[PDB]
Amino acid sequence: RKPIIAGNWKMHKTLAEAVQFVEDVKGHVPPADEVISVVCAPFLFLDRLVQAADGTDLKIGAQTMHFADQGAYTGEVSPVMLKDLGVTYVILGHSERRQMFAETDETVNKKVLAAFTRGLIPIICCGESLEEREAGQTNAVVASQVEKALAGLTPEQVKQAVIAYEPIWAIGTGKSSTPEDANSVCGHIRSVVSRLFGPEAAEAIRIQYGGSVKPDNIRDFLAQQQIDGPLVGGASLEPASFLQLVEAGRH
Amino acid sequence: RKPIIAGNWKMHKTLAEAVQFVEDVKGHVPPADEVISVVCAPFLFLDRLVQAADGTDLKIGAQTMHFADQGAYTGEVSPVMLKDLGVTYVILGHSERRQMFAETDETVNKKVLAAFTRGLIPIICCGESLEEREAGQTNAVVASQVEKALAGLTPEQVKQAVIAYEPIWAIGTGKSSTPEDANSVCGHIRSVVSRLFGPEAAEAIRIQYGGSVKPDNIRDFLAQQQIDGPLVGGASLEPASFLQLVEAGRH
* SS3 annotation, A59-70: EEEECCCCCCCC
B19 touches chain A (CB under 8 A): no
User: 3-class SS at A17?
Assistant: helix
| DSSP of chain B | ---EEEEE--B---HHHHHHHHHHHTTTSPPTTT-EEEEEE-HHHHHHHHHHHTTSSEEEEES---S-SSBS-TT---HHHHHHHT--EEEE--HHHHHHH---HHHHHHHHHHHHHHT-EEEEEE---HHHHHHT-HHHHHHHHHHHHHBTB-HHHHTT-EEEE--GGGTTTS----HHHHHHHHHHHHHHHHHHHHHHHHHHSEEEE-SS--TTTHHHHHHSTT---BEESGGGSSHHHHHHHHHHHH-
Spatial separation of the C-alpha atoms in residues A155 and A133, rounded to whole Å: 30
- In one-letter notation, the amino acid at residue A36 is I
Nearest to B85 by CA among A212, A42, A119, A166: A42
How was this entry determined? X-ray
The separation between CA A18 and the C-alpha centre of its own chain, rounded to angstroms, equals 19
Element counts in chain A: helices (H) and strands (E): 12, 8
Mutate to test the interface with A, among B50, B74, B166, B212 (most CBs of A within 10 A): B74
> Do A41 and A77 touch, CB atoms closer than 8 A?
no
Q: Does A31 touch chain B (CB under 8 A)?
A: no
A155 neighbors A202 (Cβ within 8 angstroms): no
- Nearest CA to A63 out of A80, A84, A44 is that of A44
Query: CATH number, domain at B116?
Result: 3.20.20.70
Span between the terminal Cα atoms of chain B, in Å: 13
| Spatial distance between the Cα atoms of B206 and B149, rounded to a whole number of angstroms | 15
Q: In chain B, whose CA is at the least distance from the CA of A66?
A: B11
CA B129 and chain centroid, separation: 18
- Which residues in A lie closer than 8 A to residue B42 (C-beta atoms)? 43, 76-77, 81
- Which domain does A59 fall in, by range? 1-251
State the smallest CA–CA distance between residue B154 and chain A in angstroms.
27
Residue B76 in contact with residue A100, Cβ under 8 Å? no
The Cα A3–Cα B24 span in angstroms is 46
B233 lies within 8 A of chain A by CB: yes
A139 carries a ligand binding annotation: no
Chain A touched by B16 (CB under 8 Å): yes
Give the resolution in Å.
Answer: 2.8
Which residues of B are less than 8 Å from A62 in CB distance?
75
CA distance A82 to chain B (A): 8
Q: Are strands A230-232 and B4-8 parallel, antiparallel or unpaired?
A: unpaired
The H or E element containing residue A58 is: strand A58-62
To the question of whether residue B236 is assigned a binding role by annotation, the answer is no
Backbone angles phi, psi at A249, to 5 degrees: -75, 50
Q: Are A135 and A173 in contact (CB under 8 A)?
A: no
For the question of residue B94 being annotated catalytic, the response is yes
Distance of CA B80 to the CA centre of its chain: 19
Euclidean distance between CA atoms A221 and A248, whole angstroms? 10
CB B224 within 8 A of CB B183: yes
Of B71, B84, B101, the CB nearest to A14: B84
Q: Is A55 annotated as a binding residue?
A: no
For chain B, breaks with the C atom over 2.5 A from the next N come after none
Distance in angstroms (rounded) separating the CA atoms of residues A92 and A186 = 18
Our CA-based measurement puts residue B73 at a distance from the nearest CA of chain A, in whole angstroms, of 6
Out of A13, A72, A85, whose CB is closest to B96? A72
* B166 carries an active-site annotation: yes
**Contact map slice: B 38-77 vs A, CB within 8 A:** 42-48, 63-64, 66, 68, 70-77
Nearest to A87 by CA among A39, A131, A130: A39
First to last CA, chain A: 15
Domain count, chain B: 1
Q: Using a CB–CB cutoff of 8 Å, tell me whether B12 touches chain A.
A: yes
- Quick count: other Cβ atoms within 10 Å of Cβ B91? 28
The residue annotated as part of the active site, out of B96, B103, B128, B166, is B166
The candidate with the shortest Cα–Cα distance to B142, out of B71, B202, B93, is B93
Q: Which residues pair with A11 in a beta bridge?
A: B71
Nearest CA in chain B to A47: B44
Select from A121, A95, A124, A119 the least CA-distant residue to A108: A124
Which SS3 state, helix, strand or coil, does residue A92 take? strand
| Catalytic position from the list B94, B103, B128, B247 | B94
Residues of B in contact with A10 (CB under 8 A): 71-74, 76
Q: How far apart are CA A242 and CA A18, in angstroms?
A: 13
Sheet holding B231-232, edge to edge: B206-209, B162-165, B121-126, B89-92, B58-62, B36-41, B4-8, B231-232
